[PDB]
Amino acid sequence: MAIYADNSYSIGNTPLVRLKHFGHNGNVVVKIEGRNPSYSVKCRIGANMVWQAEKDGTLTKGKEIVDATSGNTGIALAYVAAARGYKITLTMPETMSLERKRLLCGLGVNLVLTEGAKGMKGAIAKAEEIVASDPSRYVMLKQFENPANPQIHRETTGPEIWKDTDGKVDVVVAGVGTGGSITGISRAIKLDFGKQITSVAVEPVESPVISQTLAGEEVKPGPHKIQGIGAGFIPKNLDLSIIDRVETVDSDTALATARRLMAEEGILAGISSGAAVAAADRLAKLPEFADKLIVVILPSAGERYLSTA
Amino acid sequence: MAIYADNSYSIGNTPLVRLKHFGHNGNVVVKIEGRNPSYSVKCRIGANMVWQAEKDGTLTKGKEIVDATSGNTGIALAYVAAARGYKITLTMPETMSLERKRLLCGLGVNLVLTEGAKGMKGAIAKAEEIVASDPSRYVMLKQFENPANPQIHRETTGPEIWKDTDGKVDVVVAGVGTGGSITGISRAIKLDFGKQITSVAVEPVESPVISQTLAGEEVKPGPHKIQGIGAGFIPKNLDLSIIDRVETVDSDTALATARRLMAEEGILAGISSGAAVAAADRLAKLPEFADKLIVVILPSAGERYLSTA
């Protein structure tokens, strides 16, 4: 057989494509996370956070999911909630784009808009109030600290990279949001496969908080246009111990690099995908990395309307 | 190994998911064509029409692709042209949505807008003029009659359905645009595997031209909102001989059914995906089809902004 009992179980097995106009002699290869149920790397963790919450008794028939997000992880949780029969509340500011509202209403989400002036703070409060209102009803899965998040990457994303390269991967380049990807991938290859690879974290030069921490310098975040990376703090799901190297990238370059992915490689991916590649391209063009296979996570699919396509 | 030398070669291997709120006892299973390079069933034929044109000498270094389309097949050709280093012209009316323009410019297409008043006729003329201007330069791959189109479905889409069901598929339900899908799938299972399945074509009740032809009645098309099916004529790539059954569906139902796919199954698919499912659900709820595995092509991914999400 090979028929998924629901859409959640179809996560991953995403492809590796070799880049032609990046790297040297084809040392740069990309893994298309756009090719997922809800079209992002995130529905891997959408799937396993719900599954883990089930297995350990925190999520049960009748019980409902609450989360203060509207990005790839909201969409991801939505599809699994729809797929598995959970009611879901996502809180976000009333200033969110009609687009994202429409997409999430479509997936059967109860949309609680919070005050726009309260920014993201205010959506987090409103989620948290709903949870205090009845703690036997609503569950917050908490992507930033939930081990289920990096656990899925250790069990699927990581092994898939091992498999499809035949143990030949030397370098892994992954933008950091929750840190879940890099953490899980790196644990799989270094610890379950026993290969001493170079794991490279990627962050906005505008918010170089991983770089600052490790240098022992004032953590100072700021705004950037690289959606889904550069949270402005070190997440619990970032395991600083498996990070070999930290590469910073600027918005403009992430943008331009995602543009190039389209017109020169024919790969529709997101801003963070560009960020990831510019970092890899830089590494790949250093002689110390000449004869080394570098693998890059492209987190999302390009189909948007705001800076780029 | 398993690293694609370019994005074109990553086509297919798309998943089968079982529906919970459709069919009976889970006799309805869906194959997610959203999970492709350019995010549609079409980049399967984007890939193989170019490959075939290469193998037989019609497409060569320097030579350029021209096509009067802007739907899934334009996007598909774009990604392969970008992936393989071909210049591409797509003609379409100047009335196309900024969205589709932006997406295609992004993939490195030369966009030739034709008069809006000339409708689709006028884009076809303008393509055809460019081809007459220099026949050693520009090539029209012609999805409606190109055998490479159904050939890819015989070689990939069909086998994948065979494999993942373990020879247990009984019914195949597929909306008709070019006919390429149904034709290729059905040839694979009936002729290469030797299983006497029921191939079901799906069309808008508003343009029931397959139904009319076979009844020997006046072919009379009309407008419908089911994007990518119901062309208003019988394509050469529709092999009427392998069609067992023709199911008509209305726009409203296709729409509503795609809405249900989202909120009840957590599957983001397109209008034509809804059309496909309502037809399958109807068949699946007939006792003659009770103990039969029905497989449905979901051609596209939902991420749009016009009627639905």
Swiss-Prot record, chains A, B:
Pathway(s) it belongs to: Amino-acid biosynthesis; L-cysteine biosynthesis; L-cysteine from L-serine: step 2/2
Chemical reaction(s) catalysed: O-acetyl-L-serine + hydrogen sulfide = L-cysteine + acetate
GO cellular component: cytoplasm
Family, per entry: Belongs to the cysteine synthase/cystathionine beta-synthase family.
Protein name as catalogued: Cysteine synthase
Top-tier EC class: transferase
Complexes and interactors: Homodimer.
UniProt source species: Haemophilus influenzae (strain ATCC 51907 / DSM 11121 / KW20 / Rd)
GO molecular function term, any single one: cysteine synthase activity
Gene Ontology process terms (BP): cysteine biosynthetic process from serine
Gene: cysK
InterPro entries noted in UniProt: Cys_synth (IPR005856), Cys_Synth/Cystath_Beta-Synth (IPR050214), CysK (IPR005859), P-phosphate_BS (IPR001216), TrpB-like_PALP (IPR001926), TrpB-like_PALP_sf (IPR036052)
Taxonomy of the source species: Bacteria, Pseudomonadati, Pseudomonadota, Gammaproteobacteria, Pasteurellales
Signal sequence extent: none
Keyword Magnesium part of the UniProt annotation: no
Keyword Cell membrane: no
Sequence positions bearing N6-(pyridoxal phosphate)lysine: 42
Binding site for pyridoxal 5'-phosphate: 72, 177-181, 272
Keywords: Allosteric enzyme, Amino-acid biosynthesis, Cysteine biosynthesis, Pyridoxal phosphate, Transferase
Cofactors that this protein relies on: pyridoxal 5'-phosphate
Entry EC number(s): 2.5.1.47
Domain of life assignment: Bacteria
Protein residues bound to hydrogen sulfide: 7, 35, 268
